[PDB]
Design a protein around this ligand. Structure first.
Ligand SMILES: [Cl-]
Ligand SMILES: [Cl-]
Ligand SMILES: [Cl-]
Ligand SMILES: [Cl-]
Lengths: 67, 69, 67, 67
């Protein structure tokens, strides 16, 4: 394989990021449990998109599997 | 046809493939304690640790039921 | 058309599995009869759920219909 | 590795650049939100291609990943 052109072309076709409400529902936790995981750690990697918090679907899945 | 990260994220926004112990036990026809005990004895299905909360992927449940190695 | 989200949602609403007693009553056999068929390597396909034999309703019907 | 011929060959097949609408949708913010951040020094690096703003996908990802 993947170069910058494939990455850009895929990025124009959709998004891999979920918000907190979506990440929590997908992984089967309370939104508040997920938020509290940010502050104490132990939860999945997030991204700070400035103000907003965003979760990359493949980082959710990695965390779930222990990978 | 092979799904990319956009595809996976788009499905994840529409549902969840995970069950808690109580739901997983009901689905497989066992008591919750029996399923919990198998986490100690071994011999039950793969599960995920989502922090301190145990979750079961429905397809890893079906795998275990069907005897996939 | 079903994906992993559909399968989990359905699994959360009930169970397709019968124990030996239920399966026997359903196919019109004694519980003992159904066990011996299993122990002799015959009868319907079943699942080992740990120490507990379980029967999927559709595998029960497949075996009954000889197809 | 790449020589200049390789870079040119790749540039002739695709573009690594997204506009604001595309870049916003990919990182999961509104278009307006992403514009706003151009004034803040919070958001991702951008290129000014004359009058028009463009985001290199790899800089989008570096900013999200916190570099
Ligand atoms: Cl919770
Ligand atoms: Cl039981
Ligand atoms: Cl009989
Ligand atoms: Cl060169």
């Amino acid at each position: 394989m993947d170069d910058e052109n494939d990455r850009a072309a895929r990025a124009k076709k959709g998004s891999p990021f979920l918000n907190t409400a979506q990440a929590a529902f997908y992984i089967g936790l309370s939104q508040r449990t997920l938020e509290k995981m940010r502050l104490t750690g132990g939860g999945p990697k997030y991204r700070k998109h400035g103000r907003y918090v965003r979760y990359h679907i493949d980082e959710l899945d990695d965390w779930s599997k222990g990978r």
